[PDB]
Amino acid sequence: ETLGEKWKKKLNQLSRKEFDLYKKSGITEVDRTEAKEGLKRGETTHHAVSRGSAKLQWFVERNMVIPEGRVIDLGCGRGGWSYYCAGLKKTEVRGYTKGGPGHEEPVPMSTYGWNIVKLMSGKDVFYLPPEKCDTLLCDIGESSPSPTVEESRTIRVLKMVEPWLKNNQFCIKVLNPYMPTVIEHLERLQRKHGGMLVRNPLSRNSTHEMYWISNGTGNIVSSVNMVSRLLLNRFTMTHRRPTIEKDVDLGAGTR
Ligand SMILES: C[S@@+](CC[C@H](N)C(=O)[O-])C[C@H]1O[C@@H](n2cnc3c(N)ncnc32)[C@H](O)[C@@H]1O
Numbered sequence: 001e002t003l004g005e006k007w008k009k010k011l012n013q014l015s016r017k018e019f020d021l022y023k024k025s026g027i028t029e030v031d032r033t034e035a036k037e038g039l040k041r042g043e044t045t046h047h048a049v050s051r052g053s054a055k056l057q058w059f060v061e062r063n064m065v066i067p068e069g070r071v072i073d074l075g076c077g078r079g080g081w082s083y084y085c086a087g088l089k090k091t092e093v094r095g096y097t098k099g100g101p102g103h104e105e106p107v108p109m110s111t112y113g114w115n116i117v118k119l120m121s122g123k124d125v126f127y128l129p130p131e132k133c134d135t136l137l138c139d140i141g142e143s144s145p146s147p148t149v150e151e152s153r154t155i156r157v158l159k160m161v162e163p164w165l166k167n168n169q170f171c172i173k174v175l176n177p178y179m180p181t182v183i184e185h186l187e188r189l190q191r192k193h194g195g196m197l198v199r200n201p202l203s204r205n206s207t208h209e210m211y212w213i214s215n216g217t218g219n220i221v222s223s224v225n226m227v228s229r230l231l232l233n234r235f236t237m238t239h240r241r242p243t244i245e246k247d248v249d250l251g252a253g254t255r
C-alpha cells in the first residue's frame with residue numbers, strides 16, 4: 001500500500017475541526033480579501049476571479065509551462081487560468097467548462113487582454129473533440145473521500161487530454177498521482193510527451209494533486225513519494241499558519 005493511501009486514510013479519519021486546521025497547515029496562499037470585496041461589488045478590472053490565476057502564475061513564473069499562441073483551458077470554471085494567460089505577451093484563449101448545478105460559471109471580466117478570451121459553459125470536456133492549440137491547460141479533477149473514485153477520475157482526465165497534446169506547452173492537473181495504475185499512465189505519457197509532475201505550494205494539504213507541466217524532467221515516482229511524505233508529516237505538528245502572499249493584479253485594457 002502506497003504512502004498516498006496512508007495519507008488518504010489518515011485524512012478521512014480527521015474530524016471537521018482537525019481537517020480545517022490541517023488543510024492549510026504550512027501551505028502558501030494569496031490574500032484574496034481585496035479581490036473578493038471588488039468582485040462582490042461587480043468590479044471588472046484588476047481582480048483575479050479565483051485563486052486559480054495565482055496558482056497558474058506560480059508555474060509560469062518558474063518557466064514550467066510558458067503559455068503562447070492559442071491557449072485551450074479545459075475546466076476553466078470562473079476563468080482564473082484564462083484571464084491570467086490573456087495578459088501574457090506570447091494570442092487567443094478558449095476556455096471550456098461544464099457549468100450548471102454544482103459547478104462554477106465563467107465570470108465576465110475586463111482585465112488585461114479580456115478581448116482575446118472566450119469562455120464557454122455547458123461543455124463537458126469528456127465529449128469534446130480535440131482542437132489544434134499551442135498551449136493545453138487542464139484543471140479538472142474533483143476530490144472524493146474515495147481514493148478509487150479519485151483514481152478513476154485521474155485516469156479519465158489523462159486519457160482525455162492526450163489527443164490535445166501535439167508538441168505543445170501544457171499544464172494538467174493530476175488529482176490522485178500516487179495510485180500504481182495512475183503512475184503507469186504518467187510514465188507512459190512522460191516518455192511520449194516529456195515534462196514532469198510538480199507539487200504547487202498553493203495546493204491545500206487536503207488534496208494530493210500535482211501538475212504535469214511540459215518544461216521539466218525528473219523521476220515521477222520520487223516526486224510523488226516526496227509529496228506523500230510531506231503531507232503525512234504535516235499531520236504530526238500543530239497547525240502552521242499559511243505563508244501569505246500578494247494576489248495577482250491582472251490590470252485592464254484590450255490587446
Ligand atoms: C479546479 S476548477 C478550475 C479553476 C480554474 N483553473 C480557475 O483558475 O478559476 C475545475 C473546473 O472544472 C469544471 N469541470 C469538472 N468536470 C468537468 C468536465 N467534465 N467538463 C468541463 N468542466 C468540468 C468544474 O466545474 C470546475 O469549475
Ligand SMILES: Cc1ccc(C(=O)O)c(NC(=O)Nc2ccc(C(F)(F)F)cc2N)c1
Pocket residue numbers: 099100101102103104105
Ligand atoms: C457546491 C458549490 C460551491 C461553489 C459554487 C460556485 O459556483 O462557486 C457552486 N456552484 C453552483 O452550484 N452553481 C450553480 C448552481 C445552480 C445553477 C442553476 F441550476 F442554474 F440554478 C447553476 C450553477 N452554475 C457550487
